[PDB]
Ligand binder design. Structure first.
Ligand SMILES: Nc1nc(NCCN2CCN(c3ccc(F)cc3F)CC2)nc2nc(-c3ccco3)nn12
Ligand SMILES: CC(C)CCC[C@@H](C)[C@H]1CC[C@H]2[C@@H]3CC=C4C[C@@H](O)CC[C@]4(C)[C@H]3CC[C@]12C
Ligand SMILES: CC(C)CCC[C@@H](C)[C@H]1CC[C@H]2[C@@H]3CC=C4C[C@@H](O)CC[C@]4(C)[C@H]3CC[C@]12C
Ligand SMILES: CC(C)CCC[C@@H](C)[C@H]1CC[C@H]2[C@@H]3CC=C4C[C@@H](O)CC[C@]4(C)[C@H]3CC[C@]12C
Ligand SMILES: CCCCCCCC/C=C/CCCCCCCC(=O)OC[C@@H](O)CO
Ligand SMILES: CCCCCCCC/C=C/CCCCCCCC(=O)OC[C@@H](O)CO
Ligand SMILES: CCCCCCCC/C=C\CCCCCCCC(=O)OC[C@@H](O)CO
Ligand SMILES: CCCCCCCC/C=C\CCCCCCCC(=O)OC[C@@H](O)CO
Ligand SMILES: CCCCCCCC/C=C\CCCCCCCC(=O)OC[C@@H](O)CO
Ligand SMILES: CCCCCCCC/C=C\CCCCCCCC(=O)OC[C@@H](O)CO
Ligand SMILES: CCCCCCCC/C=C\CCCCCCCC(=O)OC[C@@H](O)CO
Ligand SMILES: CCCCCCCC/C=C\CCCCCCCC(=O)OC[C@H](O)CO
Ligand SMILES: CCCCCCCC/C=C\CCCCCCCC(=O)OC[C@H](O)CO
Ligand SMILES: CCCCCCCC/C=C\CCCCCCCC(=O)O
Ligand SMILES: CCCCCCCC/C=C\CCCCCCCC(=O)O
Ligand SMILES: CCCCCCCC/C=C\CCCCCCCC(=O)O
Ligand SMILES: CCCCCCCC/C=C\CCCCCCCC(=O)O
Ligand SMILES: CCCCCCCC/C=C\CCCCCCCC(=O)O
Ligand SMILES: CCCCCCCC/C=C\CCCCCCCC(=O)O
Ligand SMILES: CCCCCCCC/C=C\CCCCCCCC(=O)O
Ligand SMILES: CCCCCCCC/C=C\CCCCCCCC(=O)O
Ligand SMILES: CCCCCCCC/C=C\CCCCCCCC(=O)O
Ligand SMILES: CCCCCCCC/C=C\CCCCCCCC(=O)O
Ligand code: NA
Length: 388
């Protein structure tokens, strides 16, 4: 049995290295949002709240985790706070991640009413409520769902603990049925699955909207061919009626409106000639639509396609952050499931427990890198902060 301080020295050194990187990276995130007005939006307010929780992981949760790894003597309820505060920060991160996904769904599914529905004041109230709810969820053991009524007295005496004290160890004071049923299943797994469903809806909405743009573009070009090779006025009228409904459907900003004003008006001009039985004159009037399509309509199609592809890319970046949260925290949750559900299984070894703990803490480091690599506005703001 090698001296415990040796293995503890590696674990403590790694934890402190994680804490430093978690503080610097996420302070840089908050500093960037504070300085750049282009980064000041509802989505990034939840990013800041997420960054604040990761800052608290380095300032508080990691020192708390180092403290509880020693098994020091402590009053059991004070031990619970040290043990459970990281659950407040993890829960707050989950609420921020869910809000970011929901915010991205509103912007892509109903962009016309997004700005009136999603405001900065309403976001601040949501952030405040989610932090209060995270304290209630994470500190639920302090409300009575704990093992403080059944302390390990033999372990407390062997450590020389005083009266009313226990050896402060995570699995000794925090019930595993809380950790699995309440914290993992209800408060972590279910919101994460809701996040996945929201992201599936986002990408499905983006894919559908892109296909609709290409469908209206095809409908515009197909019916033009129908008009050119029509032999009676009724055929020209049929295609023009479908184009007019498609043109108004694509219309659902001044150069935008003018280009569609010309398009619909030119369709109405040809429709009037078609109803008069003037086939040759209607087809020639419909040929003018090609000038409007090249000069105006195609530019709107490409810009609309460009805006949607940026929303997909922004939603992928946010989904990567949620996926990395799941990847970093799931091993610790899964180990707790083995400890709880399989008492006949040998406990996961010590080195694996602290590997899972370190990995969960590493998640507080990774988000600043995802923003820097995937969001130009952050990366450029990061550069200006560092240079100056
Ligand atoms: N489960 C857990 N533990 C800790 N810290 C204590 C580590 N010791 C756990 C006991 N063990 C052990 C016991 C008997 C053995 F035969 C072998 C062992 F190796 C030593 C090591 N911290 C945590 N945090 C979260 C957590 C936070 C969010 C989700 O889960 N679970 N968790
Ligand atoms: C706002 C920030 C800076 C304040 C940080 C306060 C932290 C460090 C304080 C608040 C409550 C404190 C705990 C309260 C009770 C106990 C029980 C005692 O037997 C050992 C210490 C222990 C476990 C304390 C450790 C430190 C502690 C967690
Ligand atoms: C989310 C992704 C990374 C999957 C994570 C898989 C990890 C967490 C899984 C894969 C294999 C698992 C181990 C397989 C077998 C045992 C032996 C048992 O006596 C205690 C648990 C223990 C030690 C498991 C702990 C959790 C474990 C390490
Ligand atoms: C987010 C994704 C990974 C879904 C989460 C799946 C979790 C809940 C699953 C994956 C593997 C599962 C474990 C696999 C094997 C065992 C051993 C058995 O003796 C008791 C149940 C137990 C311990 C399972 C509990 C639940 C478990 C941890
Ligand atoms: C032991 C005690 C430790 C203290 C833990 C306290 C945890 C609470 C921390 C909360 C940080 C939240 C920061 C989140 C800040 C988000 C920015 C914002 O909301 O502004 C948007 C509006 O201004 C626009 O109108
Ligand atoms: C935009 C800014 C956001 C501001 C965030 C607001 C700060 C949230 C603070 C919440 C405190 C509520 C705590 C309520 C949660 C219950 C747990 C508890 O209080 O246990 C402590 C005692 O049992 C000890 O004996
Ligand atoms: C404790 C953890 C540290 C947390 C610090 C949070 C600082 C957040 C500061 C960064 C957010 C400022 C902001 O969003 O302003 C927007 C307004 O200008 C609206 O226009
Ligand atoms: C800065 C470094 C502060 C860390 C100080 C923590 C010291 C505790 C220790 O190393 O012994 C306990 C372990 O042996 C567990 O058995
Ligand atoms: C900035 C805020 C300053 C905070 C500093 C706290 C750093 C960690 C200080 C924690 C030291 C606790 C300690 O030494 O206890 C020893 C006894 O248990 C021996 O029986
Ligand atoms: C800035 C805020 C301070 C950040 C981190 C503070 C670290 C908290 C560390 C908590 C130390 C508790 C302790 O060592 O007690 C030992 C004795 O009570 C045994 O009887
Ligand atoms: C997604 C859904 C995730 C939850 C499904 C996994 C549920 C895991 C339940 C394991 C269980 O019931 O064990 C009982 C026996 O081991 C007693 O010996
Ligand atoms: C939504 C907002 C949630 C906050 C609402 C109420 C917080 C009540 C906090 C009461 C904490 C007292 C717990 C206590 O000290 O009792 C000892 C322990 O519970 C026995 O093991
Ligand atoms: C979406 C999220 C999925 C949440 C589903 C949970 C089903 C869990 C049902 C477990 C049924 C009881 C298991 C049991 O009793 O065995 C545990 C044992 O007591 C340990 O010591
Ligand atoms: C990311 C970096 C990964 C490096 C992994 C090293 C960290 C932890 C595992 C080391 C084993 C330490 C056992 C803990 C002993 C103790 O706390 O008493
Ligand atoms: C990084 C700074 C070095 C920290 C060394 C940890 C030793 C503390 C200990 O085991 O008592
Ligand atoms: C993770 C680490 C990224 C940190 C890069 C250094 C920038 C620090 C500047 C700051 O604290 O604002
Ligand atoms: C440890 C906690 C550190 C939190 C870091 C958050 C920094 C971001 C915003 C805080 C507000 C900025 C305060 C100074 C503003 C001065 C100025 O605007 O020129
Ligand atoms: C920027 C502020 C961040 C706070 C830095 C604090 C760093 C201290 C790190 C670890 C504290 C470990 C506490 C040791 C527990 C005592 C061990 C024992 O009593 O047996
Ligand atoms: C439930 C916890 C309650 C917390 C009180 C926080 C105050 C929030 C009010 C603002 C609501 C909003 O504007 O959406
Ligand atoms: C851990 C148990 C969770 C607690 C369940 C219920 C606690 C709070 C419930 C809902 C808070 C709703 C927020 C509404 C605040 C008012 C909004 C407004 O002023 O417009
Ligand atoms: C529980 C596991 C799921 C965690 C992943 C959550 C969000 C990423 C969504 C992926 C996009 C489709
Ligand atoms: C390399 C990082 C960890 C990789 C795989 C985890 C597998 C650990 C399984 C060891 C079984 C522990 C035991 O004997 O109970
Ligand atoms: C001390 C271990 C810290 C490892 C952090 C890993 C996350 C950083 C991401 C890309 C480089
Ligand atoms: Na986090």
């Amino acid at each position: 049995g090698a001296p415990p301080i040796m293995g503890s020295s590696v674990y403590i050194t790694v934890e402190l290295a994680i804490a430093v990187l978690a503080i610097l990276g996420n302070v840089l995130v908050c500093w960037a949002v504070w300085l750049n007005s282009n980064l000041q939006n509802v989505t990034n307010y939840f990013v800041v709240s997420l960054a604040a929780a990761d800052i608290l992981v380095g300032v508080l949760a990691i020192p708390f985790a180092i403290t509880i790894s020693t098994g020091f003597c402590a009053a059991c309820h004070g031990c619970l706070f040290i043990a459970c505060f990281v659950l407040v920060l993890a829960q707050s991160s989950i609420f921020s991640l869910l809000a970011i996904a929901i915010d991205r769904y509103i912007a892509i599914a109903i962009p016309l009413r997004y700005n009136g529905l999603v405001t900065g004041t309403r976001a601040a109230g949501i952030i405040a409520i989610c932090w209060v709810l995270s304290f209630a969820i994470g500190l639920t053991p302090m409300l009575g769902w704990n093992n403080c009524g059944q302390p390990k007295e033999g372990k407390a005496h062997s450590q020389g603990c005083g009266e009313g004290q226990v050896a402060c160890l995570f699995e000794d004071v925090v019930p595993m049925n809380y950790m699995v049923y309440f914290n993992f299943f209800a408060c972590v797994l279910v919101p994460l699955l809701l996040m996945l469903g929201v992201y599936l809806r986002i990408f499905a909405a983006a894919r559908r909207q892109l296909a609709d743009l290409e469908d209206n573009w095809e409908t515009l070009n197909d019916n033009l061919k129908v008009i050119e090779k029509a032999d009676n006025a009724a055929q020209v009228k049929d295609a023009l009626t479908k184009m007019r409904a498609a043109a108004l459907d694509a219309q659902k900003m001044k150069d935008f409106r003018h280009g569609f004003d010309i398009l619909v008006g030119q369709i109405d001009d040809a429709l009037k000639l078609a109803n008069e039985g003037k086939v040759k004159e209607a087809q020639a009037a419909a040929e003018q639509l090609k000038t409007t399509r090249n000069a105006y309509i195609q530019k709107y199609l490409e810009r609309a396609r460009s805006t949607l592809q940026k929303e997909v890319h922004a939603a992928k970046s946010a989904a990567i952050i949620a996926g990395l949260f799941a990847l970093c925290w799931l091993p610790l949750h899964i180990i707790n499931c083995f400890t709880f559900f399989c008492p006949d299984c040998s406990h996961a070894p010590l080195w694996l427990m602290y590997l899972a703990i370190v990995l969960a803490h590493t998640n507080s480091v990774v988000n600043p890198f995802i923003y820097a690599y995937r969001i130009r506005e952050f990366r450029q703001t990061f550069r200006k902060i560092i240079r100056s």
